[PDB]
Amino acid sequence: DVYAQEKQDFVQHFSQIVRVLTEGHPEIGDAIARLKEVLEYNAIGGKYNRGLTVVVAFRELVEPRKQDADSLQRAWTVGWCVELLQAFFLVADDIMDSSLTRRGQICWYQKPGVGLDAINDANLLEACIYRLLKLYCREQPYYLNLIELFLQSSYQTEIGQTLDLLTAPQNVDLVRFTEKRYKSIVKYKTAFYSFYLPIAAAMYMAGIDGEKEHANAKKILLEMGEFFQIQDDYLDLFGDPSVTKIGTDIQDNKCSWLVVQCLQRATPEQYQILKENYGQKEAEKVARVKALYEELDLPAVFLQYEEDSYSHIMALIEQYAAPLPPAVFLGLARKIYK
Amino acid sequence: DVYAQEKQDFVQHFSQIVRVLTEGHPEIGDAIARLKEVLEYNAIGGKYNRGLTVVVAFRELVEPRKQDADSLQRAWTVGWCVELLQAFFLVADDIMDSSLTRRGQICWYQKPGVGLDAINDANLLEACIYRLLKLYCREQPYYLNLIELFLQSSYQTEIGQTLDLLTAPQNVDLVRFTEKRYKSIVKYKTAFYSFYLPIAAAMYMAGIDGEKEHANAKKILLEMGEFFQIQDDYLDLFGDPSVTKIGTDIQDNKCSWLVVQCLQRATPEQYQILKENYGQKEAEKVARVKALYEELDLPAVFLQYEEDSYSHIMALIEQYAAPLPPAVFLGLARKIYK
Ligand SMILES: O=P(O)(O)C(Nc1cncc(-c2ccc(OC3CC3)cc2)c1)P(=O)(O)O
């Protein structure tokens, strides 16, 4: 509810984000209208967890007497920058994976009269981050630190995307689905921008700019990010859609935690069943896969992993949170846990 | 030849650009190999005019006693950053336009086993700019100015791309091909990153960071950029491939200077011929278009435009070059003129 409290004013701020990004240069009006449409379609409709973490962390990291009106405008804005980063990645990712829907809406690129123009639209969303940072934060001591953090985050995510694309050519081979490779993908592709970025942005805005402090936060948050993606992979199969969307990882030939662990623990005659069934449109095949996972006690393996993980994270928060308040980590953990 | 003199050491520096961008983190090796391939395929093979302008301008803007070894490493590097910016735009543009070749080579996205993964590859090329700037320029006083210049340049180009895409839906309507719209596209899509960016980067590296100075340079260079794109449109039709590639603007339904001027100067019965012929795969139609341009004395209109343009540019260089040496502009002009 620390998140539920901030959410009202966060989403309300979006209206202003859009105003300023379309606010002189009359010749480009039509392009700016297109920009407006891209923002409204792509940046709105999710949970906004990543953005909100910026604002919640800011509240927990700054003396309450130094949380003036301006400071809060800036914290909302950087939060919206995180959401724009995410929109950039997802618009582009949806093209690369030939996805149909995102958030139960037709993917932007699939809207008629959009198509591959969405590539430029994604790029504009990335541009908007640095426009906002300039408009709201150029005079601040942390300005350069945020620019570099956003850029570093894009690069990390892109490297991760490269690994994903090398790992599952859309021509998939299960020999490539290893744990070391699974961990790298999650780390570079999701954990950095999802878990490290928002807290880091908040750290910098509160004057916490030390390498060791950042290294400590990053150690905790990367492991949080690892856990939560593995949790998403599991829920994709063994969840209920009410609890979670509907799961399609198997028919999609994904390098999912489930498949990875399956491969580690199998006699030679179980690879040559999974080969047979993994990635097929038909549903009798998708059931064979689930039933194999079930026969391999992968819930149990998950449960054991969930325990080791909770323990290790709490230990890390004990060691490395200081001098940040532990509730910064603990809150995010509680909030993402599904 | 001021360009021909710098070219040897510029292209040689590329080897180092690639070394440092693939130079600790063993888990991502395969992604870094992919990065190596993307750089070598996409950043190499052009004339390198934009990159080289950075180096040539640097030589003309800095006291020769302050052109130490390090300074030259940095000037080569920022030049290569300009070339990487261009690779980013062209890789992505080739996808959006469904292009086949670029520089008589198969477009990157058309290479088998690449496809729409090229979207991420383009993004990596953009990432590499800010990696290089950090590796070579983080300690310099102009560091932030360059970061912002590259980002501003991406945004401008992307806005321009949006206008192009709105102007010629790949569903083209000639009513949209206006001069005011033609000028905006060229300005935002090509002139800023091609003409303003490289000189500006050089200005900043030489300590010339004043708004008025930049405004003055930009006034000259944007008009240079306008002229040279209009020159490219003309040559596309009325050139010889030896002088120039082969021209395909007409069958491609392009908002080209030629078509634009055609529309301004036509009786109602000439729109309804151009409607008929513009954008058709067949070659008897493409000849009708050329013959119409010829009948409209568009060479003459070009010639008249070339004269007015040379005069105005020289006048601008007279007024606004100072305190930059006029040879900075004049050289670029001479070098780009085809
Ligand atoms: O509620 P669940 O059914 O999911 C139970 N799991 C549970 C109960 N209480 C705490 C956790 C927990 C919380 C956070 C965790 O990781 C985040 C700190 C990164 C990991 C596990 C997990 P279980 O699956 O063991 O029956």
Ligand SMILES: O=P(O)(O)C(Nc1cncc(-c2ccc(OC3CC3)cc2)c1)P(=O)(O)O
């Ligand atoms: O050599 P060309 O045949 O192209 C001759 N043109 C020509 C001759 N001398 C100088 C120019 C000139 C150079 C630079 C120009 O613009 C650059 C400063 C931006 C414009 C025109 C153009 P023309 O077409 O008039 O017979």
